[PDB]
């Protein structure tokens, strides 16, 4: 599978630089303005997005849950106890299958939004990420998937969500790719924000992903953006549930509560040094929990790749409806047999007599963002046989529902196993250990965040987002001391959930930063050598056959160090452009394989898609005249056409005169960034990276071109065999 | 005056070969954990520091303040009003006296911390930013200033005093400026950190201040260092001022406290959206006074320079007694008859009679810190006129004390004034107005915050740490809504206190990023064509005479495009050095002014140190053997004598043979960053400022180096004079 890259860097030419001397600084400041504009326009869409599918989630799930209920009570006084089922089935399987049809419809909705939105911030472009079809889909996909008690999230699809809608909105100026990804930036901060009400931890998992150069202007817009959807959320979402509208009483979907300990017991804190120690333990034994979860999760998609991916598309709607079965009865079972109901709103009366609720029951039938709080607020509600229960149901389930054919997340399901596992040990240390003044509520919260270090294997973005969930600022050093613990744990094994999602799919992706071996290998080994080059004054049939030919999305425009009409116009840009150090001092006073393989001049790199523009006008001059006579395609003319550029297939080929000059000089980047063959690997990744550029051509101290360097060069597969290499030559 | 720049960025040489050679995979880790280690040591050290400053602040001003209380006691029952006065002037009058001294000895320890540590971070190397005599220095004088009334703080020294241990303690590896920047970056961190609570924004405050590329491995590192700070000053000063030692009860030197409404009341609630209204004119009127402070301070600032900083040190000394005494007797006058004191553990009760407290006396003789939290969570206890005296008697004060020979900061003397002006809006509002529900703690902070966004002029990194001072979520909309107004208010007039205080010094500082008419400029610009170059294997009498003559830190190893011994092995080595794109793909396949400004091929770069390095020792070779022989220093040998490397002038210069050949290839920078002639300014900039490097060299497309860059032809005022002449030109 081939993915294209973006094109972030700033590509400066003749109309841009026309339309800068056009530009003053009155109109500099308006478009800024209407930067910010677009920003709040973007925040506020995300919110407005996220309060629509909380809405219809809770509607829906109270709906089903509601007829669920008057059917136990009817059909446990009859006995049947079999109707409650096949109506709960009948919801389940209806929302199950609902959800997956729109997957298939858009193949790029299945599953959480972050393995491709890593991508896209990393630059990788693939098919389908933001588009309207791609978010109708998902977000009329999450609410028929999480209502149907699939033990999927909604946080998860939430960023990929912002993201769609901030490459979106500012689409109609802002045509260029450079503003695009900072725009989706922004949007997936304000996803972020809107899903756990995190509007810092949205912009640094922002930083965090899109790693490029510290741009306080885009950082400060980003906060913004996620600032206003987190509190457009919380305006409607808190006064929908209450009377009072101008309150903002409730953060987005995802909330702990408050940390708060009993005021009748003085000596209780929230937590103490002495407890610190499990801290590190409930670290490690949760994040070779989260380990095992990986040893599951790819072991199951590898699986699918290979022998349920290529089958007709009758298959994976069958799988979701299987899953969705075996949870329904799993719930059910689980709920009406191994639930130890015990003597007394979220408080649920099933199978056995009058005040006697099941633990179980409170645990499934309640939302999933409803049965965290219990988790975290609630002592003695849960007997350590059903929370361990719990745990086993909820790990293997979730480990089996990832990864079908329906919109999903990996922070609430993740996020509730943890909390069972902590309560669990809490009650574990009280009863047996006999150590009081356990506050339970911070050892569910460790349990959660050790467990999402495991699993998800986030640092920065994921404390952050942890801290101001928890609305506590004392609770800093126990949730980072142990995300750090379980990454260090969960590291020895396998990576990451996303990590190996995207590593499957086969996409190219740069890691964060390279080994220390990797300085060995120089910038001379990972280049290519051959060249696809482009002429100034080239011919046109030349061009429409490089085109053609090769697949190329970037061309060194170079001329030969070493017709009569483009000869003589080549040499005379070439000694036209040069610019000698004396020269420039006066200026500012005055105010075969060998053929195969031949000596070229770096002169500047020219674009496919720009030379398709080109192309398909009449910009092209006869041999005859000279080369002044040009169409000179403006800035705004350059940029039509920009989402989807036309194919060189495409064009009708008949029309174009072959044989005849076409001048690329005007257009092209006369100054992109370049290394020395000497440089290191260290400091090319870094510009390839944290520039955001394509395409670095290498260049020799001579000035010609040596090699040419692209994503595809860097990623870590090819630097590990370029180093074996290495190795085994000297 | 004149600075010189930061090495920081990497230079791969021969002997940095060997080393990566040498160290391999499990080194590598060692080294990593090793690292880990110093970021603790440095987090903690910086906890016990302002465990220091804060312990012996408060044992300080207790004592001045009990012995005050006593004989005001005893003297208004006698009447003499006079003897308190002389005790209370005696105590400050000694302990500005003894701040001053200790400024006296170290000059930068001046003021706050945050302008010359805006600058390090720079990489600017102000004389004396980071030194044990200057840590020293500070920390005595912080505790020795704030302990004698000067409406000064503590947790701007904090910033400094972090920076210094972070560069100090990996000191004992990690020689190299690389690591040093990284390492105060950290020491930075833990400094915000300590100082207002808030780790989050102290490693946002070091990204946001040390522009570069994104590096997670360090900011995981420096967000470990501030955690660890926080939380071990946590640990010392909730386990010192109550007796319960395992708790974390109280954050950092500046907390806020519990903002939480009155239970009594249901319809109360933290802020409205009706309110947001009133949260930007407190952003505007805030802002407004923030120029006007700047107004002020500024001209007394240059006042100074003028008339005070070039006298004799008795001078400089005076100034501050006289800032003490008229500030003491200011606090004792209007506490005495402005003070309208009311009906009844921070309660003062001065020269009115039982059950009455003076509001003014709580004010002014209760601890700054502990003055925020009464204007935040107590109604009813100040009337209007109190409030409207004390803003104006702490506005004109902070702005005389601001700049005079003493530690000093600027964040509690503008958290306090704008406090007390937000709550005098909210009680007005109360009262005439009459629109009630208005809490007045979050007027009071909006307040606070609106004058901090007026004064100081931040942001990202302050809105993190106001938020996380205020320990609630709900409260960042207002909160940052009214910084960003602040901010776009005060612009219009002047820039901050710590953007005036670095122009003032005249430090070569680079903005955050440059306009829109800077593009119309390009690199052929800003360079200078005239350099002064260093042959390889050059003659040693021409390395001292360019060494003595010019004051440059690094020359390009450059030959010639166009003794017999020298030119004979220059030409080898350009022969070899060249890297032919055939040549390169056989090796994989195998497996007057025109003599004074003349055409030179571009090959590396080499610093001075390195330079006087070679020099000191016998690296040299006589023109009759070959060049083979060299002693070839290891990179342990070249990394001696780092802190401060020799000067030329101090080296002997008699027993070096002048004519004697010396190469410079193995040490050079072979493959340092480049630029076109035909980039533009913005590309340049973004080089120069993210990657942190220095000496960027500008080469034309035939490889021959056409000039040189560095953060002096990169500064605000060059590029403007620039523009200017470009405009005129044209
Ligand atoms: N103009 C070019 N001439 C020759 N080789 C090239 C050229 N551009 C890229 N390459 C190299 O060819 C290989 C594959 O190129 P490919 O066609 O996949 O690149 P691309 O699609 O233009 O790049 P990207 O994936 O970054 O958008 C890589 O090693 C790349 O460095
Ligand atoms: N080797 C050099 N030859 C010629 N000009 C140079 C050289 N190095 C710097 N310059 C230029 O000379 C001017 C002043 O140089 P200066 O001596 O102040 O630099 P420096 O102290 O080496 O640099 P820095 O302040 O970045 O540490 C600037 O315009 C700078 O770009
Ligand atoms: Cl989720
Ligand atoms: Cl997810
Ligand atoms: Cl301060
Ligand atoms: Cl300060
Ligand atoms: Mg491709
Ligand atoms: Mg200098």
Redesign the interface.
């Known amino acids: 599978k081939d993915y294209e890259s973006l094109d972030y860097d700033?590509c400066?030419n003749d109309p841009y630089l026309e339309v800068?001397?056009t530009?003053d600084?009155k109109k500099?400041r308006r478009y800024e303005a209407v930067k910010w504009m677009v920003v709040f326009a973007i925040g506020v869409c995300t919110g407005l997005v996220g309060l629509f599918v909380d809405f219809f989630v809770r509607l829906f799930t109270q709906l089903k849950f509601g007829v669920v209920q008057t059917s136990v009570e009817e059909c446990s006084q009859k006995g049947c106890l079999a109707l409650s089922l096949l109506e709960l089935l009948g919801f389940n399987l209806t929302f199950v299958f609902l959800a997956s049809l729109l997957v298939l419809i858009e193949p790029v909705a299945a599953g959480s939004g972050i393995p491709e939105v890593k991508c896209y911030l990393n630059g990788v472009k693939v098919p389908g990420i933001v588009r309207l079809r791609t978010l109708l889909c998902k977000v009329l996909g999450v609410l028929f998937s999480v209502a149907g008690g699939l033990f999927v999230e909604k946080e998860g699809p939430m960023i990929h969500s912002g993201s769609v809608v901030g490459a979106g909105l500012p689409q109609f100026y802002f045509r260029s790719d450079r503003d695009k990804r900072d725009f989706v930036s922004a949007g997936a901060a304000a996803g972020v924000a809107a899903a756990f009400?995190?509007?810092?931890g949205g912009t640094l998992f922002s930083?965090?992903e899109g790693?490029?150069?510290?741009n306080?202007?885009l950082?400060?817009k980003v906060?913004?953006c996620s600032?206003?959807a987190?509190?457009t959320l919380?305006?409607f979402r808190s006064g929908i549930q209450f009377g009072?509208?101008?309150?903002?009483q409730l953060?987005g979907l995802l909330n702990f509560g408050e940390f708060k300990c009993s005021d009748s017991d003085k000596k209780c804190?929230?937590?103490?040094?002495?407890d610190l120690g499990f801290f590190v333990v409930m670290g490690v034994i949760g994040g070779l929990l989260g380990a095992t979860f990986n040893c599951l999760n790819k072991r199951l998609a590898k699986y699918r790749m290979r022998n349920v991916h290529p089958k007709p598309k009758l298959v994976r709607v069958l799988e979701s409806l299987l899953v969705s079965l075996v949870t329904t009865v799993v719930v059910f079972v689980a709920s009406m047999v191994l639930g130890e109901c015990r003597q007394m709103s979220s408080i649920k009366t099933f199978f056995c007599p009058n005040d006697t609720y099941n633990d179980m029951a409170t645990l499934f039938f309640n939302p999933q963002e409803s049965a965290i709080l219990q988790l975290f607020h609630q002592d003695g509600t849960f007997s350590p046989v059903t929370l361990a229960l719990f745990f086993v149901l909820y790990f293997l389930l979730a480990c089996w529902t990832y990864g079908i054919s329906v919109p999903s997340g990996l922070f609430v399901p993740s996020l509730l196993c943890g909390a069972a596992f902590g309560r669990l040990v809490a009650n574990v240390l009280k009863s047996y250990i006999g150590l009081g003044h356990i506050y339970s509520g911070t050892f569910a919260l460790i349990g959660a965040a050790a467990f999402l270090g495991g699993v998800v294997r986030m640092?920065?973005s994921l404390?952050?987002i942890l801290?101001?969930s928890t609305?506590?600022?004392?609770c800093?050093?126990p949730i980072?001391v142990t995300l750090?613990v379980a990454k260090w744990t969960g590291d020895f094994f396998n990576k990451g959930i996303y990590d190996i999602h995207v590593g499957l799919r086969g996409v190219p992706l740069l890691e964060?930063?390279t080994?220390?071996?990797m300085?060995?290998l120089r910038?001379?080994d990972i280049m290519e050598?051959?060249?696809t080059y482009v002429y100034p004054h080239t011919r046109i049939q030349s061009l429409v056959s490089i085109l053609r030919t090769t697949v190329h999305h970037a061309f060194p425009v170079v001329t030969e160090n070493r017709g009569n009409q483009l000869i003589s116009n080549n040499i005379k840009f070439k000694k036209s452009?040069?610019?000698?150090?004396?020269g420039?001092?006066?200026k500012?006073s005055q105010?075969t394989?060998?053929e195969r393989?031949?000596?070229?001049?770096?002169?500047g790199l020219i674009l496919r898609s720009q030379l398709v523009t080109l192309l398909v006008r009449g910009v092209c001059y006869s041999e005859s005249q000279s080369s002044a006579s040009q169409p000179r395609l403006s800035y705004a003319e350059m940029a039509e056409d920009y989402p989807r550029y036309p194919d060189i297939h495409d064009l009708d080929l008949t029309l174009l005169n072959p044989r005849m000059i076409v001048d690329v000089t005007p257009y092209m980047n006369?100054?992109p960034?370049?290394?020395?063959?000497?440089?290191?690997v260290?400091?090319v990744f870094?510009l390839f990276?944290?520039?955001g550029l394509r395409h670095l051509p290498v260049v020799?101290?001579?000035?010609?071109?040596?090699?040419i360097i692209t994503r595809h060069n860097l990623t870590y597969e090819f630097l590990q065999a370029r180093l074996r290499?290495h190795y085994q030559?000297i």
Chains 1, 2 share one sequence.
């Open positions: 700033r400066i800068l001397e530009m600084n500099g009400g995190a509007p810092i930083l965090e790693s490029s150069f510290w306080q202007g950082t400060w906060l913004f600032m206003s987190t509190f919380n305006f009072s509208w101008g309150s903002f953060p804190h929230l937590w103490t040094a002495m640092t920065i404390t952050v801290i101001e609305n506590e600022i004392t800093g050093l980072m750090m964060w930063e080994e220390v071996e300085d060995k910038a001379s050598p051959n060249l452009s040069i610019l000698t150090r004396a420039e001092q006066r500012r105010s394989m060998e393989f031949r000596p070229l001049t770096f002169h006369p100054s960034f370049t290394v020395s063959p000497n440089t290191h260290s400091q870094n990276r944290t520039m020799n101290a001579v000035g010609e071109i040596v090699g290499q030559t």
